[PDB]
């Protein structure tokens, strides 16, 4: 589990969104595994605006933050889980790292701020849904 809290937005994995998220919806995209809902309180996270390929992510199944090298956001075939049919997921970055399901939501960050959130992985893979192209998260 986990979310990004930027401005009056809450960014979560679409597959983990609550009824309150869907009732206060700003934007969602199944192909990216992302959903954004509105918040009453202002958040403290800042979004990175860059092309970094190194950063650190939080792994809840280890209680640890790990430094990683990750690929640029791409269209990747991901295997069937309980949440999606084997399909192509867009705007996804991969790194080598310990992952399990309930880790989705952990933040990946670089020197500029939050890069994305955990979404896919297994066999020492961890896939992050990028948010750096969502420039509108910084306004309104
Ligand atoms: C971090 N992590 C490890 C996983 C192992 C297996 C499945 C994962 N992801 C999901 O269930 C969510 C999903 C995205 O696209 C399709 N399904 C994993 N995430
Ligand atoms: Zn960066």
Longest CA span, the chain: 40
What is the CA(35)–ligand 2 centre distance, in A? 22
The residue assigned the tokens 């992510």 is: 57
* Closest listed residue to residue 3, CA positions, set 48, 41, 35, 29: 35
Q: Measured from the CB, is residue 37 less than 6 Å from ligand 1?
A: no
Local structure of 19: helix, strand or coil: helix
The total number of residues written for the chain in this structure: 140
Cα–Cα distance measured from residue 9 to residue 11, given in angstroms and rounded to the nearest whole number? 6
Technique used by the depositors: X-ray
Q: What is the resolution of this structure in A?
A: 1.1
Q: Which residues are annotated as a binding site for Zn(2+)?
A: 50, 52, 110, 112
Residue 33 near residue 14, CB atoms below 8 Å: yes
- Between CA 24 and CA 32, with CA 28 as vertex, the angle to 5 degrees is 150
What is the CA(80)–ligand 1 centre distance, in A? 8
Say which residues have a Cβ less than 8 Å from residue 134's Cβ, sequence separation at least 6. 36, 47
Q: Which residues are annotated as a binding site?
A: 50, 52, 110, 112
């Amino acid at each position: 589990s986990g979310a990004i809290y930027v401005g009056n937005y809450r960014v979560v994995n679409r597959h983990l969104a609550t009824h309150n998220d869907w009732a206060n919806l700003v934007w969602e995209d199944s192909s990216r595994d992302l959903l954004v809902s509105s918040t009453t309180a202002q958040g403290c996270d800042t979004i990175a605006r860059c092309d970094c390929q190194t950063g650190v992510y939080y792994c809840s199944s280890r209680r640890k933050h790990y430094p990683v090298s990750f690929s640029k956001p791409s269209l990747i075939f991901v295997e069937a889980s309980e949440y999606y049919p084997a399909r192509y997921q867009s705007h996804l970055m991969l790194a080598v790292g310990h992952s399990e399901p309930g880790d989705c939501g952990g933040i990946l960050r670089c020197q500029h701020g939050v890069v994305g959130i955990v979404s896919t992985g297994g066999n020492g893979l961890v896939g992050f849904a990028d948010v750096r192209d969502l420039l509108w998260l910084d306004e309104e």
